[PDB]
Amino acid sequence: SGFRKMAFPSGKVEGCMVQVTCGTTTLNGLWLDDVVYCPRHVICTSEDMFNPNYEDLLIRKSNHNFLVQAGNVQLRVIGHSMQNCVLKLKVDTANPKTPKYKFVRIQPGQTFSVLACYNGSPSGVYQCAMRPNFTIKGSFLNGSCGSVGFNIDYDCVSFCYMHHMELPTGVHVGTDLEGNFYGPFVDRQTAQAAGTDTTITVNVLAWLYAAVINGDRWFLNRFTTTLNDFNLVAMKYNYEPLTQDHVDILGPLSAQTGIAVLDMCASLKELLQNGMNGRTILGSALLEDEFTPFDVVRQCSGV
């Protein structure tokens, strides 16, 4: 037993990270087949980033201006293109370590693993949720752009995130692997607002189920509620409204504990209105919402 925030094993992605340098700017790229993907602001000087015209900037760059390095081994760039906010650098060698992979655009409330890299070398791996306001609470320093987020299903890597920027609030924003930003953000170093964030209700419920599956029961009570009655409370606490789809997704957990979903909603309601009284759930004194229902099943059954 036990429950932890767990990242996917990163080996399949580690073999795809390379370094991309353009003039004095260096960040990471993702090498799949004969293409290297990287954020387009690699072509900016630290001064261009406050208001770049990426078209005019790219027009002064040729293939030999993109230095791509896999380990200590250099790659030869034979073409380049700009797709939305990423660059696609064509190289003359297919990555012999390319895994089976897909590009997917993840939905808010889903989770994924981030392999934080610098100079094309992995630094560490951690799990993130795509917030409802399309931000993530990451750990990113200068040079970390091009670090990617991913899920793994058996042997297939679904790439869903490439890192680009940190907002003034300390949260992090990026694109899918076709260069489209998650959320209302642009890759210009100017003040940008993510808007009100809300708690992922279905994930909090899954984590309360995970808590019961691991022996923390003090918050179960003799009450029940309705979808409509609970959502009047979710409103007051900037929680996502719960839906019947959410209820269905909690089915497997509702069946392994024997606790009806609306009964667990009744516990959550009391925790929202009364706090935790200095008690703790799975070693946390806050309500955690970065575990999907899928995440709890996977960990509580050894996938």
Added chain:
Amino acid sequence: SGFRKMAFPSGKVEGCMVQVTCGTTTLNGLWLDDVVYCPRHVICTSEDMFNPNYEDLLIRKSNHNFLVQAGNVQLRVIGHSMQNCVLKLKVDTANPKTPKYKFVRIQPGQTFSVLACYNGSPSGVYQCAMRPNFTIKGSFLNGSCGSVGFNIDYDCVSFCYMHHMELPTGVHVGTDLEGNFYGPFVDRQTAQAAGTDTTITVNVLAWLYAAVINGDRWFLNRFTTTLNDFNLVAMKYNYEPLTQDHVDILGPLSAQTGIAVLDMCASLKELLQNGMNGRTILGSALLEDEFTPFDVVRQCSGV
């Protein structure tokens, strides 16, 4: 910026995990050079585990009784030996993926990454601290034994932990890679007590420094303290006594924030005596102690 619980990239270890089966018991082994390391209770039936005589049990096993499988590829076992609580299975093939590696015995209060595996296949990776009472707060199901804990320094993997057992309290115990248990534990499925756990004071201080480096400042105050005065408080709260060695290790953080270590101790003292008043530090409402000073430096400088 940002601060997260981050595991090392797991690729170098993923290439060393194999499956080891003996009769009906299956767990994981670590394949390095021409040797596979695994917990010795792989030779037990589920009934033997409540009181095994490992010598008498091993005497009925030959090389061909140890089924070792790397992916879908079987390995040929040409010798076996029992060193303390692990088995060493000699195979006729050296792991072509063997990294540079060391076997180290970690100290209480240090951290390491766990690659949780089942059937020789990685499931996920997470960071753990070796508690002062020589337990860890992991995520382990049946079949996870043989999962290993490790650190990485550039290209060298320091293996420090192999998983064996879950105590009745829900915490997890294991050995170093020479088969010696961390703590007062034996590999028999009987009730065993880890004893009082205590909070890793030096790690809490490092995480408060990490909080300042990331903009959480509300807990800084106008007070200071002495090593002796603080440790009279640490006592009351089952905190590890702070030492001058601890003070030195916090030097780099004490120099990047400009906050004297005894001043930060004064903040911790007030947080212990007064709680957090429903406030939060790096998104947690508890005092976190599973980050070493080394861990904070590494993450706040991109190693």
